[PDB]
C-alpha cells in the first residue's frame, strides 16, 4: 500500500506510490504501508472479494475497518507492526491462514483471538506476556502455532524445552496438535513414540 484514505482513491495511490496491480482483488500483491494508516476503506469495499492480503513491510496505529476486515483469510506479511487492538478481534475470526513471519505485538486481546485462531506462522514475533499469554492465548485449545522467535518462546527456551512441549502435547493434552512444529527435532519420533507404546 501506499497511504489509507478511501477505497478509490487508495487503489489508484497503490497503483501509483506501491505501482501495482490491486483492481478490487482479493490478491493485492503490494510491498509496504505507514504507519499512520487510518481506515482502511480498501479493505471495507473490497472486503466482499478478499483473501490474499500481501504485504512486505508494514506498520498499523489505527483500524478502524474492522468491520471490514472481517473477510480476510490469507495473511500473507512478511515484516510488521502492529501495536493497539482495534481490528485484531474482525480478522481473527474470519481469518484462517496468518502467514507472517515477523510481526511486533503486545495487546492482551489481540492475541488472545489471533493466536487462538486455525493457523498462524510467526517465525520472528515479539510478545513476552507468559504471565497471560502462556495459557490466555487460548494455549490447551489452538491448533497450528508456529512462533519460533518472540521473548515468550525464548524465555520457555527455543531449543530445549521445544522436544518437551510437543511430547507433553501428544502423550498429556486433547486437541493442540502443532505446538511450534520445530519440537520433532528427530526425537517426537522416538522419546513420544516410546512414551505413546514403542
Given at each position: 500500500?501506499?497511504?489509507?484514505?478511501?477505497?478509490?482513491?487508495?487503489?489508484?495511490?497503490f497503483?501509483?506510490?506501491?505501482?501495482?496491480?490491486?483492481?478490487?482483488?482479493?490478491?493485492?500483491?503490494?510491498?509496504?504501508?505507514?504507519?499512520?494508516?487510518?481506515?482502511?476503506?480498501?479493505?471495507?469495499?473490497?472486503?466482499?472479494?478478499?483473501?490474499?492480503?500481501?504485504?512486505?513491510?508494514?506498520?498499523?496505529?489505527?483500524?478502524?475497518?474492522?468491520?471490514?476486515?472481517?473477510?480476510?483469510?490469507?495473511?500473507?506479511?512478511?515484516?510488521?507492526?502492529?501495536?493497539?487492538?482495534?481490528?485484531?478481534?474482525?480478522?481473527?475470526?474470519?481469518?484462517?491462514?496468518?502467514?507472517?513471519?515477523?510481526?511486533?505485538?503486545?495487546?492482551?486481546?489481540?492475541?488472545?483471538?489471533?493466536?487462538?485462531?486455525?493457523?498462524?506462522?510467526?517465525?520472528?514475533?515479539?510478545?513476552?506476556n507468559?504471565?497471560?499469554?502462556?495459557?490466555?492465548?487460548?494455549?490447551?485449545?489452538?491448533?497450528?502455532?508456529?512462533?519460533?522467535?518472540?521473548?515468550?518462546?525464548?524465555?520457555?527456551?527455543?531449543?530445549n524445552?521445544?522436544?518437551?512441549?510437543?511430547?507433553?502435547?501428544?502423550?498429556?493434552?486433547?486437541?493442540?496438535?502443532?505446538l511450534?512444529?520445530?519440537?520433532?527435532?528427530?526425537?517426537?519420533?522416538?522419546?513420544?513414540?516410546?512414551?505413546?507404546?514403542?
Amino acid at each position: 500500500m501506499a497511504k489509507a484514505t478511501t477505497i478509490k482513491d487508495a487503489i489508484r495511490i497503490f497503483e501509483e506510490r506501491k505501482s501495482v496491480v490491486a483492481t478490487e482483488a482479493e490478491k493485492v500483491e503490494l510491498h509496504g504501508m505507514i504507519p499512520p494508516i487510518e481506515k482502511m476503506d480498501a479493505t471495507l469495499s473490497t472486503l466482499k472479494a478478499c483473501k490474499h492480503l500481501a504485504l512486505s513491510t508494514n506498520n498499523i496505529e489505527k483500524i478502524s475497518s474492522l468491520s471490514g476486515m472481517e473477510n480476510l483469510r490469507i495473511l500473507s506479511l512478511g515484516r510488521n507492526l502492529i501495536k493497539k487492538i482495534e481490528n485484531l478481534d474482525a480478522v481473527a475470526d474470519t481469518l484462517e491462514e496468518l502467514w507472517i513471519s515477523y510481526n511486533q505485538i503486545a495487546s492482551l486481546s489481540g492475541i488472545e483471538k489471533l493466536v487462538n485462531l486455525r493457523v498462524l506462522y510467526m517465525s520472528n514475533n515479539k510478545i513476552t506476556n507468559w504471565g497471560e499469554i502462556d495459557k490466555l492465548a487460548a494455549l490447551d485449545k489452538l491448533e497450528d502455532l508456529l512462533l519460533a522467535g518472540n521473548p515468550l518462546y525464548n524465555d520457555y527456551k527455543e531449543n530445549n524445552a521445544t522436544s518437551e512441549y510437543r511430547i507433553e502435547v501428544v502423550k498429556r493434552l486433547p486437541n493442540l496438535k502443532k505446538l511450534d512444529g520445530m519440537p520433532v527435532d528427530v526425537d517426537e519420533r522416538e522419546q513420544a513414540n516410546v512414551a505413546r507404546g514403542g
